[PDB]
Design a binder for this molecule. Structure first.
Ligand SMILES: CO[C@H]1[C@H](O)[C@@H](O)[C@@H](O)O[C@@H]1C(=O)O
Ligand SMILES: CO[C@H]1[C@H](O)[C@@H](O)[C@@H](O)O[C@@H]1C(=O)O
Lengths: 671, 671
């Protein structure tokens, strides 16, 4: 019915097998049961062996040992250094007797992640004769947000319908949920919100007795795979389903209603993760988001729940005429002032950028600006503005640029990753969340290669220091095999895809220029005169948003001095973000030597040629990939090439018609 | 529940009444029954009298006589000249005895229209002491097309939900259908298609036994008011509900299926009007529209049904890059060549313009170009591109410009009205159709004053020679009374509204510049790079579509020599249509003396001020109009003023940003 994605566990040849007679499972918990089953599955499929599962080591048998520190006979030094609950150690016994692999986790979850790491080593064909590994995740929260609706639709879903809901109910099918959990767990994802942040009528009832049994059934599966379950809530629930006259967070009965709702939820799901909130809301009653979030936080506190408060807030009724109002400044101006007013179990979830998941956006100034408030970054795996899984776009490189961005909050070495992993400000709760890119499509992600974005998200969530190169390598090998041509080719495609897509879309960081509504395809003035605050201000002389303090919106001042100065100056501002920070003449000379207008022409003409190359390189792999996936991808790559041509021409023509400046190289621009 | 619109029958004062003791109804048919009931209603409400209904004249009683020629004792000369079946004569007896009013119709329908004319005279307070009237409609078909869907929605409906359907079924309520029929009949409308031309799944079943009983129930009501009922059909019905493998009009079984469908329909509705068709279609199987239409025509022929084939056909996948392809030429190039190949009961329905109901479009070249093919013009009463009933837009003046347009098909005096009334080419069937502007809203049309467009459509349909001035006068008096200030003010508002709306929307006939999808509001580049063939080609130097033969698409050649030459020349082409026919520099000087760019600024700034005046004039009527309607309209006028400001600024800014030319008068243009 559907692909196994990167958990193929392809059968090894006779020269790449392992000899094991037993699996020693020191524990019998539901998680351990899933761990054992997964190990059996991988070893059976890959090695064609079926070790017996036991609870005590057989001194003379080759074994894989699974357990926690408390299960050890002799606690060696390495595992003794473990402090993170989800951390683990994998080491081969150094003695000369039977072969033994020890997978030691700080907790059961640790053993689960350790096993998937062990299986990953096998899929990649690593020598496990002398292993000595210690791994602890950097981010406490490694979450996935689903924008699934209960009618089956998925907001911004380009990979089919929801695998959770249908006909305003839960799918009677749960086997796919189990395989999805296995996939998420394989890359360390430990938290999930199953419903759209835009909570509609039916979804509002997910926190009521009518649907809680079903939610609990889903949570039971995820729990088995070390995944905590969350629900996006409707802030107006007290009114819509509570029978109350208001949703005011300060109203005594409203506060009580939520506390009772929390209690009720925990009776079905004892380890419920908490609420994800997109917010009639607090503003409706003159309350600020601290008051709004803290009320929900107080309801969940007794149960250990968390409130994930999204900071995607802005004036969705902005006047395009007013160049003093800047949507990019909204998030910071709204939350920065509230630092230190939020309850301990509240985590502010902030998008990587201050606008809205554009192909390229500078880093949200909020990161590093709130020392006393937990923060978590939200990235979008589903490609809303990045190709919608029609165009290939491996998002890992972009996410690393964001994660490695130094905010200088506490001087050099204050990278975003250190802000969200909680080390910089000692955040009790923090991490990263990704908007799911899956659907009912057999290949899960619409575009076969988009599977790499989900895999990659998990890898970065676990350890942001991993290189895009090794993440791509791991994914390709596990998904398509180790043929050097296949690996080198697909890895190259993945690693260069984002830049290629940006080349023929929005120029120099200004973003947008997409069709309104569905957001797919070129439309330079699409939202140019809208009330969404997404403008490029292109005219016959130049383009760009002046966000300088000197003459613009003053957005640059939201960054710490080092970055503020870099963007403030027209001479130091990076080319790739120039139009996001400065309004400049088309003739303005970039650091690359190109005028702004010629740069536009260059990347659009050249981006299309690069897209053709992606397709050509893929075609050269025919015969080395099964026919089904070969054609699924070829189909998409062709769709990409044809659409890229539309992006190229629409943008080139628009700017030629406005600037009146011809392409330096005389390439075809339709007048 | 809803307003009576123009059939108010307001109670007259004691000095404006009539003395009648009897109504002589010479016939007992369902139509006559409705006629009598309407007369009783009007006389009771207006005159507070209740004449007894009799079948024989009382020599000594003041009476209103109703009958046809065959019912007359003495057939006078006037009614003796009647030839049209729906014509009638109204004359006061010239003798000195009792007062007698004779309403003589050629057929029952004629008597119905005669009575409504009599009632109209009373509502307007005309002296009926010495009447001598003869009226015969110019257009055989005076039709209304409904874009209602069975789920209750109305495509391009801005006046509420369908009054016909709900929950994929017919409304159990029929009283509103009766009052709607009364309204349509009052203005001579004699035909109606009750469902959307875009026939969806459920609507496709309107031609099956499952829904025919309901359709018949609706048709029974309309029949009583002289209205023939039609259904829009799904050309693919043979496949969707017929169980056949194809819809090919030349497939033997397909032809048979339609003939059987027709027979079945006529068993429920003996006088069924026929099918309205928007067309898997003939093109799908390499057949032309003559073959497509003739197949349906052959099925209806034995029953006297008609096939209304819409010519709204074009490449909905046009390349914006190709300036040689012109959507405006499509309709003519598609149908002109087929003249003389259509069956006698087929009528080609053509929109007033060759594009798509824009605020201003030149006349469709098809009118006058097909001497051997019946034609009917389609106009849009619902204001899709003309304010959507938020902005006031009395469409009658525009329709008269189209109707009075001389095609010169047979030399001077070949106006569009003479083409569609069938007199120019002796068309057996022809006329005019209007896309309904009603909905479930209590005031029927969303905007109270939009009621005038429905009324006006009927009046022009009956007699295109009626002036916009008298049509507006009739409507205002009947709807709001005869206070001279009220009449003069509302009439002025109606008569100037269209020009006002055009002033702040699309300039000089180029059209569009609307938001995509819903089509409401400014968005200059909205469809500029779309595949719909709706482009203005504005750049930093000029704007316009070159449709000349000399250098453009050659669209001008579709008109007869006299009009072709007028539009072909840049010097003779009317300003109001200049950008539809020529691409010109912004500095091009118009006949008005304005440069094209300054004209744009002028009409947009001034159009807003004119809109403010509409509101001001309405406010001055407070106290002379009931509070409910006064405020309903004031609300809309305020909405109009505010939106006009958006139209003004968006368009002015777009062209300033592109042309770089400032407003001559230094008015506020946001940079
Ligand atoms: C779920 O709503 C989404 C929305 O579809 C998307 O287009 C954007 O505006 O951001 C959103 C968000 O992150 O709330
Ligand atoms: C019913 O479809 C409509 C359509 O809503 C409208 O936007 C336009 O394109 O013309 C149509 C037509 O007259 O078929």
């Amino acid at each position: 019915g559907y692909e196994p994605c990167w958990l193929r566990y392809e059968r090894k040849d006779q020269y790449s097998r392992l000899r094991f007679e037993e699996i020693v499972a020191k524990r019998t918990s539901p998680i351990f049961q899933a761990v054992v089953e997964e190990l059996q599955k991988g070893l059976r499929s890959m090695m064609e062996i079926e070790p017996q599962v036991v609870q005590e080591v057989n001194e003379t048998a080759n074994s894989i040992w699974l357990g926690t520190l408390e299960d050890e006979e002799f606690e060696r030094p390495l595992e003794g250094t473990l402090v993170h609950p989800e951390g683990y150690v994998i080491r081969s016994d150094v003695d000369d007797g039977p072969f033994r692999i020890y997978i030691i986790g700080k907790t059961d979850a640790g053993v689960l992640y350790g096993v998937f790491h062990f299986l990953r080593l096998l899929q990649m064909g690593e020598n496990i004769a002398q292993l000595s590994i210690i791994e602890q995740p950097k981010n406490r929260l490694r979450m996935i947000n689903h924008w699934d609706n209960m009618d089956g639709s998925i907001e911004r879903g380009y990979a089919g319908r929801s695998i959770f809901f249908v006909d305003d109910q839960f799918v009677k099918q749960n086997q796919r949920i189990k395989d999805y959990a296995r996939l998420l767990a394989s890359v360390g994802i430990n938290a999930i919100s199953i419903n759209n942040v835009n909570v509609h009528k039916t979804e509002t009832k997910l926190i009521t007795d009518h649907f809680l049994p079903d939610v609990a059934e889903v949570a039971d599966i995820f729990r088995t795979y070390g995944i905590k379950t969350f629900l996006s809530i409707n802030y107006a629930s007290p009114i819509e389903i509570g029978g109350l006259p208001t949703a005011d967070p300060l109203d005594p009965e409203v506060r009580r209603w939520w506390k009772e709702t929390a209690k009720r939820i925990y009776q079905y799901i004892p380890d419920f993760g908490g609420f994800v909130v997109k917010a009639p809301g607090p503003f409706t009653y003159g309350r600020d988001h601290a008051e709004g979030a803290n009320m929900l936080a107080e309801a969940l506190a007794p149960f250990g729940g968390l409130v994930i408060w999204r900071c995607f807030v802005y004036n969705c009724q902005q006047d395009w005429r007013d160049r003093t109002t800047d949507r990019a400044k909204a998030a910071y101006d709204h939350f920065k002032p509230l630092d230190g007013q939020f309850r301990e179990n509240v985590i502010l979830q902030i998008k990587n950028g201050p606008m809205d998941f554009q192909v390229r956006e500078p880093v949200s100034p909020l990161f590093g600006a709130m020392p006393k408030t937990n923060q978590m970054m939200e990235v979008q795996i589903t490609q809303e503005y990045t190709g919608q899984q029609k165009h290939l776009c491996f998002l890992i490189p972009q996410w690393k640029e964001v994660l490695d961005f130094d905010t200088y909050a506490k001087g050099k070495g204050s990278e975003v990753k250190k802000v969200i992993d909680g080390s910089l400000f000692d955040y009790r709760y923090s991490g990263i969340a990704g908007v799911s890119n899956i659907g009912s499509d057999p290949n899960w992600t619409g575009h076969t290669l988009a599977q790499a974005n989900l895999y990659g998200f998990g890898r970065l969530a676990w350890n942001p220091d991993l290189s895009a190169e090794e993440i791509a390598n791991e994914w390709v090998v596990q998904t398509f095999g180790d043929d050097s041509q296949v690996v080198e080719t697909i890895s190259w495609m993945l690693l260069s895809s984002w830049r290629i897509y940006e080349n023929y879309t929005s120029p120099l960081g200004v973003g947008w220029m997409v069709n309104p509504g569905h957001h797919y395809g070129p439309n330079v003035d699409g939202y140019e005169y809208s009330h969404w605050g997404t403008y490029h201000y292109a005219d016959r002389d130049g383009i760009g948003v002046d966000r300088t303090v000197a003459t613009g919106t003053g957005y640059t001042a939201q960054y710490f001095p080092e970055n503020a100065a870099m963007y403030e100056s027209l001479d130091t501002c990076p080319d790739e973000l120039l139009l996001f920070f400065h309004h400049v003449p088309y003739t303005h000379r970039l650091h690359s030597g190109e005028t702004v207008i010629q740069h536009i022409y260059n990347t659009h003409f050249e981006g299309v040629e690069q897209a053709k190359q992606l397709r050509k390189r893929w075609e050269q792999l025919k015969g080395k990939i099964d026919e089904k996936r070969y054609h699924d991808v070829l189909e998409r790559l062709t769709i990409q090439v044809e659409h890229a041509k539309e992006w190229r021409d629409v943008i080139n023509t628009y700017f030629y018609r406005k600037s009146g400046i011809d392409d330096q190289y005389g390439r075809k621009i339709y007048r």
